[PDB]
Design a protein around this ligand. Structure first.
Ligand code: HEM
Ligand code: HEM
Ligand code: HEM
Ligand code: HEM
Ligand SMILES: [Ca+2]
Ligand SMILES: [Ca+2]
Ligand SMILES: [Fe+3]
Ligand SMILES: [Fe+3]
Lengths: 742, 742
């Protein structure tokens, strides 16, 4: 529209192209995911399992908590092993031992390297080629394979049950006793584990690589990166560097950095607060309180990684609040409090868009949304608690208990209710912008893009409802990453950028044209990479090689604007020196400066570390992912939510001054604790694990023997100091916000 | 000094640390290079070769032209194969065939995959472990290995001799008939080829990887990247991205972009020209004429890659001007004309530093330098011509003929004379700055750093004299890359930056403080990466794993300032709009803008494509290196030299106006021809080769059968159009410069 028509058309074209690519890859995921075999039958004719057994095992896995106990196909938690890789390696080792006894009369390790080479070529042929699914949907496995499977089942029954010989192992895995109490459910669960391993080690019908693109790294069957893996990794590096250079060129030639005269009074402080705006103090307190609870839950989960089952000393903690539960609550609370901060920012800005007045029952809607958020959080957490104790019967686990899928752990009922709450929030936003859009004579492009960002935030949680309990793992991964990657990464980024532009234009820090054009171009750039870059979560989950290529190349373009965020950091930081009333905004602006810094480091650097297929092939499911998760999710969106609620609190209680000493302490403790956690614990552990994964295979890097090495135990312990520093910073920030609002 | 003391100390500390690292790695190269075995003896006791035979083979290789016919250990030309990889693969294949006949009675390809696995583990053990050099300096090889070597010698005798059955192959290799006419010299040469292969396939005495860090990729003996290769590649990526982000942060927070009022008259045009300055018109013409001759030689060399021995039709061209000679002249002419442009810029600026007057006999010195440059060029080229025809007797080849080492192909005598000429140039510069340094009351920091850059340019050609004809290959590589990488990349970059600062400050486009601080910080940043980054040329030439780690990590820091060169590009481009007399500088400034663009793309992007060990392990010696070489060397330093001589010509004949139509045509034809060459020929060939190298091994990607594939032949042909466009641009620029100066 107007002078911004070309930018609007660029954004529309980018959206159409990128979503077409993502949707066609979704159809590919549906069509090319590893099949659940109708029957897995031994060469002698006995049926070992059927498709329904595998699906029941998937359900039982969800009941144990799924991705919050170990990982499957490289997704999940990092204390316990990746069950796919561990099962694959154990089964291959058993096959080799049995075959070596049958062929040379000794164990595999006691025969000559030549004999070992013969055995390994036999093993590779059997697993990769002979196990390929037949036309009738059947998988035929050898009798030796059947015996190998039967030999490793007791280990997993002990790990998931109450075997006194496996107790230590269970503690080393941060697993409670009787994670899956039912023997029959455990048998189904190990059917599902076998299925995963089979998909990871069986060539695609028309290819020489497996359904998982040869993941995990397993030298025994030559599970190694394909040539296309290397090629597309290098291509993504080239695209990243060229995009960075060209974006820098465009910034240098197309941006003049105009100087704007700051208004003498704060424009936002001049508008009288509406009742619904004043009702947002409880939202501010909810955000900071959930932040404190979340970091405390992280401390508890971390204690489980050094003391697997026991506190320092009443009752057994691991029976009722095991590592699985505390990890679930730690991740879900992160999502909840960041989202609540964003929603509070929106609900505060909405009446200002509506001319400083509330529509009818806007405060009632705000209160209803608050109550609904409490119901979602409390109900989902109670459901997790009763699912993990297996008090809740299995047939209700997916709807009310634990979905077992990371970041979407809450039961489907609570997910539906959260979707309804987000829709209600969107309604309360849009009804405050209708009148502003009906206004005559005013350019609405900035408001249009801000409203589009609102719609994205309030709608794109829906794809998390597109999979079911029995949905194939690959389909669930596709839709889950729609939510986690798209809805958070891309749409929260766009909403934050548009909110920045709208807010800073209203305060007079930026020109309308600059804010509008910057927001439109930034939205186009963010979407171009983020939308198809969703596929970097699906390299090894049963998607095809082409999905990996698209994910790598487009996700590289996500980093391009991130490493240049020094410009915006400087602008936001300089705003506080523009006037005396701008100095009242120092700490929200400092939070946004930290957002820029961590969007650069944690998102760009530590996400591209794990982004190329050649790297993620080896380090998917290692601690480098935890490094990136903490740095990106908190430093970007945690600091964004904190800055938002701090701004809201400043305008809700304008008579209260920020405590500069307390805020300095909290801000620098948060930043220093994040840096310290990464530098002294998480990154060294990830590097050591990466060395092990590249050298020996992923199963080794996740093994109990390797994770219990003294250096790794020490590094996990050492994290406590940085963890305490970070928690101190979080407590300071929460205290400041609570003092302002109450 | 003064306010710049911290910058000076930072630069000094960077220089000390980085040169200490590079020197300690030089000691490591001396101590850990693959030994030349005293004797290579069969298991039966017969001596196959001795150290002196290998060194004589090295000398004979130099006589054929060395790196200009094929490549050895991944360095050299790209038409003919990498003789190390080709020899290794041929010998391993012969060993496997002989062993399979002795063990199973059939060829290796006709036995079962299990039998092949047994044979390959035997082969790997023999080559990697049993071939390790003994304490007495001896290498003991099997009788089967001896027979395998004897079976492949006829092929190489045909390739390097006149065998009518190998004629086609020779044409496909762009090799003349009788490249090495002497049979005994050929036997020595194949001793040297064996030595290289042995070093590439034999484990280091204390390690499980070879002297070449497992290069080349050869699946037969598991010549695959080590774990440290992966680890340091990922580490270099992280360092690159973090450095880019932090440098952007520093630019945003520490640069204010001050506005400077342009003087009403051009300050440089006010100074009357000295006789030595006027004597530089012949230098300008020499630069552009050598540029035209160089691009024509490139066209001839490219014609040899599609028609290996024959022109379109008198006498046989390949006997007297073979591909080896035209390639040698193409590379040497590039060096000569870029260096001449830089020297002309210095010699023009020197009297301006001296207050606009010449010291005694400065014009005589300029004329003497001109004559010495002609003698070096003509003598070295004649020596190459008489070396490649073998008219020059072998004992004088290294001093007067062809060194066989790329970029240092000229005989050692001419290299010494060029060193003397560079010293004379340095003297003529420094004697014009003595009086400026003796001046009272003026800040000399900018002049000090500019003079330091002069000293670097005039001195750091010397390390090319630190190796001899019989020096070990690794030592020669270390010292050769001192010159090619350090002296050109780092010191030409620093000299160009300092020249930019000094020139633009004298014209009044920048403030003195800004120019000085920018130059000092840029010099520190460039040196920090460039100096230890020299080791990225030595990953697989017999250096250790630690050398690879240091090279990867520090070379990644070279890219950090390159991708941000949009800032300087915009500044240089904006200078032309500052005043009416600034518009007279449009085309030198356009050349410098192109320098920024190509320093970004060709240097940063296409150098980091090939920089990480994980990538360069597979693609060293492929056409991606040619992509990067052309883009970087011309677009950065070719455009730099062209802009320098254009500026000099503008000030030597101020009454002559630039022809905007001719210059627009030439500028855009050069840029478009470079882009086209890369996009339509060189990069696609490099990508296809990379796929082949990753999938099958380097020997396959360089093989005659692969290079003669119809797609690759077509892509080589297609380069002609872009080549003609580029040559048209070069002719236009040369015509403009000649019209101005004459
Ligand atoms: C003192 C503060 C914190 C501590 C001690 C902590 C500790 C932990 C631990 C022990 C895990 C599980 C590692 C495993 O799988 O074994 C984890 C995972 C996670 N935490 Fe934190 N955390 C803290 C702060 C935060 C914050 C502030 C956020 C977000 C705002 C956050 C988000 C996450 C996420 C997203 C994961 C899952 C990462 C993945 O699975 O890749 N954490 N944290
Ligand atoms: C604010 C921006 C971002 C946030 C909040 C974020 C958050 C996260 C989180 C929490 C995870 C852990 C997922 C899991 O537990 O399975 C993750 C994984 C991942 N991230 Fe991001 N990320 C961001 C940006 C990026 C960027 C820019 C890239 C690369 C260009 C990237 C690449 C990846 C990859 C490849 C994984 C998969 C790791 C694995 O499966 O082990 N992310 N991200
Ligand atoms: C129409 C213009 C040009 C053509 C047709 C051309 C062609 C070629 C050819 C055929 C080769 C040898 C490839 C092989 O090894 O088989 C080569 C190498 C080379 N040329 Fe050019 N060239 C041109 C312009 C230039 C310019 C302007 C420069 C420098 C200012 C340059 C510098 C080099 C260098 C440094 C190499 C060696 C690269 C390496 O070995 O990695 N060329 N060129
Ligand atoms: C103006 C700057 C540069 C110039 C003029 C330049 C020039 C060249 C040339 C001519 C070659 C071919 C060498 C040969 O034939 O063996 C080369 C190779 C190479 N360049 Fe650069 N380069 C520059 C910057 C860079 C940068 C920034 C990087 C990476 C950070 C880099 C990495 C490499 C590597 C790894 C090779 C080895 C290729 C091989 O051995 O096949 N260069 N460079
Ligand atoms: Ca996870
Ligand atoms: Ca070369
Ligand atoms: Fe993502
Ligand atoms: Fe270099």
């Amino acid at each position: 529209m107007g002078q911004y028509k070309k930018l609007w058309y660029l954004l529309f074209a980018v959206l159409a192209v990128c979503f077409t690519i993502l949707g066609y890859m979704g159809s590919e995921v549906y069509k090319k995911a590893p099949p659940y075999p109708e029957q897995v039958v031994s060469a002698s004719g006995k049926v070992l399992m059927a498709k329904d057994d595998i699906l029941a095992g998937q359900s039982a896995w969800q009941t144990t908590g799924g991705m919050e106990v170990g990982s499957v196909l490289g997704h999940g938690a990092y204390q316990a092993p990746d069950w796919t890789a561990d099962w694959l390696h154990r089964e291959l080792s058993a096959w080799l031992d049995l075959t070596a006894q049958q062929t040379y009369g000794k164990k595999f390790d006691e025969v000559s390297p030549e004999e070992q080479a013969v055995l390994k070529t036999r093993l590779a042929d059997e697993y990769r080629n002979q196990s390929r699914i037949k036309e009738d949907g059947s998988v035929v496995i050898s009798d030796t394979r059947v015996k190998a499977i039967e030999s490793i089942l007791p280990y997993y029954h002990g790990v998931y049950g109450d075997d006194p010989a496996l107790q230590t192992t269970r503690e080393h895995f941060a697993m409670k006793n009787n994670t899956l109490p039912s023997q029959e459910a455990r048998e189904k669960l190990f059917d599902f584990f076998f299925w995963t391993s089979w998909s990871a080690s069986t060539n695609r019908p028309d290819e020489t690589f497996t359904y998982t693109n040869n993941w995990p790294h397993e030298p025994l069957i030559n599970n190694v990166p394909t040539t296309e893996n290397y090629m597309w990794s290098f291509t993504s590096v080239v695209l990243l560097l060229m995009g960075i250079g060209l974006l820098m060129w465009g910034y240098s030639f197309l941006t003049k950095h105009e100087e704007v005269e700051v208004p003498t009074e704060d424009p936002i402080s001049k508008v009288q607060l509406t009742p619904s705006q004043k009702a947002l103090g409880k939202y501010v307190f909810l955000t900071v309180a959930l932040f404190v609870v979340q970091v405390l839950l992280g401390g508890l989960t971390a204690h489980y990684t050094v003391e697997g089952q026991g506190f320092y000393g009443g009752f057994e903690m691991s029976d009722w609040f095991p590592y699985a539960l505390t990890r679930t609550w730690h991740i879900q609370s992160a999502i909840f409090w960041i989202a609540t901060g964003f929603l509070t920012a929106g609900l505060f800005l909405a009446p200002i868009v509506n001319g400083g007045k509330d529509p009818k029952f806007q405060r009632a809607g705000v209160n209803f949304l608050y109550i609904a958020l409490f119901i979602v959080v409390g109900g989902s957490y109670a459901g997790n608690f009763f699912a993990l104790t297996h008090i809740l019967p299995p047939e209700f686990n997916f709807w009310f208990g634990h979905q077992g899928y990371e970041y979407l752990d809450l039961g489907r009922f609570w997910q539906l209710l959260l979707m309804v709450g987000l829709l209600l929030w969107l309604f309360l936003m849009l009804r405050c912008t209708v009148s502003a859009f009906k206004e005559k004579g005013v350019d609405k492009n900035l408001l249009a893009i801000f409203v589009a960002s609102m719609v994205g935030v309030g709608v794109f949680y829906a794809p998390g409802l597109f999979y079911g309990e029995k949905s194939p793992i690959a389909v669930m991964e596709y839709w889950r990453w729609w939510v986690v990657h798209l809805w958070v990464e891309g749409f929260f980024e766009v909403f934050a950028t548009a909110a920045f532009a709208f807010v800073f234009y209203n305060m007079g820090f930026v020109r309308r044209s600059t804010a509008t054009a910057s927001t439109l171009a930034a939205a186009a750039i963010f979407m171009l990479g983020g939308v198809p870059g969703t596929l970097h979560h699906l390299y090894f989950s049963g998607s095809t090689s082409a999905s990996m290529a698209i994910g790598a190349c487009f996700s590289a373009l996500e980093v391009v604007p991130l490493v240049l965020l020094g410009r915006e950091a400087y602008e936001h930081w300089s705003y506080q020196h523009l006037s005396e009333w701008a100095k009242r905004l120092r700490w929200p602006l400092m939070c946004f400066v930290a957002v820029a810094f961590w969007n650069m480091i944690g998102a760009g650097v530590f996400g591209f570390l794990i982004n190329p297929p050649i790297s993620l092939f080896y380090i998917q499911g290692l601690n480098t992912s935890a490094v990136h998760a903490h740095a990106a999710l908190f430093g970007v969106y945690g600091f964004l939510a904190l800055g938002f609620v701090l701004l809201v609190a400043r305008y809700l209680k304008p008579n209260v001054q920020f405590d500069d000493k307390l805020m300095t302490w909290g801000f620098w403790l948060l930043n220093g604790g994040l840096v310290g956690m990464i530098a002294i614990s998480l990154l060294p552990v990830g590097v050591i694990q990466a060395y092990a994964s590249i050298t020996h295979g992923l199963w080794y890097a996740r093994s109990e023997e390797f994770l219990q090495m003294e250096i790794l135990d020490t590094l996990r312990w050492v994290r406590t100091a940085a963890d305490l520093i970070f928690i101190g910073g979080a407590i300071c920030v929460a205290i400041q916000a609570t003092k302002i609002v109450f």
